[PDB]
Amino acid sequence: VNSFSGYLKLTDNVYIKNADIVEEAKKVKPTVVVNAANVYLKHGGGVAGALNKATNNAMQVESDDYIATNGPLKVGGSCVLSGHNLAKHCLHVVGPNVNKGEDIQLLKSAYENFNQHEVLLAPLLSAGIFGADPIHSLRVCVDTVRTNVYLAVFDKNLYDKLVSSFL
Numbered sequence: 566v567n568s569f570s571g572y573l574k575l576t577d578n579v580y581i582k583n584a585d586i587v588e589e590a591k592k593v594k595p596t597v598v599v600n601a602a603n604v605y606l607k608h609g610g611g612v613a614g615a616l617n618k619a620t621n622n623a624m625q626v627e628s629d630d631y632i633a634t635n636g637p638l639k640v641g642g643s644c645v646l647s648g649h650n651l652a653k654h655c656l657h658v659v660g661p662n663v664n665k666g667e668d669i670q671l672l673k674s675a676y677e678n679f680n681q682h683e684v685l686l687a688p689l690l691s692a693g694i695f696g697a698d699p700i701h702s703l704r705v706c707v708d709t710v711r712t713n714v715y716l717a718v719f720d721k722n723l724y725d726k727l728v729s730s731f732l
């Protein structure tokens with residue numbers, strides 16, 4: 566049993582809810598919240614901008630030190646950093662950005678990072694300002710992630726379309 570509430574069950578291990586991932590993280594305080602990161606951990610907009618804002622920029626400060634030491638992530642890769650006031654840990658995952666021409670096949674590699682964590686609160690990778698089709702992102706999620714994932718979809722219209730079209 567866990568504290569996640571109001572989710573629709575899609576499969577054995579994937580759950581979905583119309584919710585602001587920032588508000589959901591603040592209420593649940595999960596072991597892992599996933600950030601929709603870029604390779605530079607520059608959290609300017611989308612989910613990343615919102616999560617970083619909610620940490621009062623502490624996520625960005627920590628991220629800049631990480632990059633200065635380690636260099637950029639790979640598209641499809643991830644790193645574990647602090648969850649600050651939102652979660653125990655933040656898993657920063659880099660899905661492909663279609664608006665940069667990155668290979669959509671890398672979306673599966675991105676979701677594979679979730680399998681290193683038993684339970685996660687997350688957004689749909691590569692959706693929103695990353696430019697991919699969110700229906701496709703949900704399909705890859707379901708077909709790749711085997712651990713327990715609680716997806717937060719900000720847009721109500723989108724949440725309804727994802728549910729109504731889910732096979």
Ligand SMILES: CCc1c[nH]c2ncnc(N3CCC[C@@H](S(C)(=O)=O)C3)c12
Pocket residue numbers: 584585586587601610611612613614615688689690691692693694695696717718719720
């Ligand atoms: C600021 C956006 C946002 C705020 N809060 C959210 N909660 C869940 N999903 C979100 N997405 C919705 C838009 C696109 C995706 S994207 C590609 O940036 O990952 C982010 C958001």
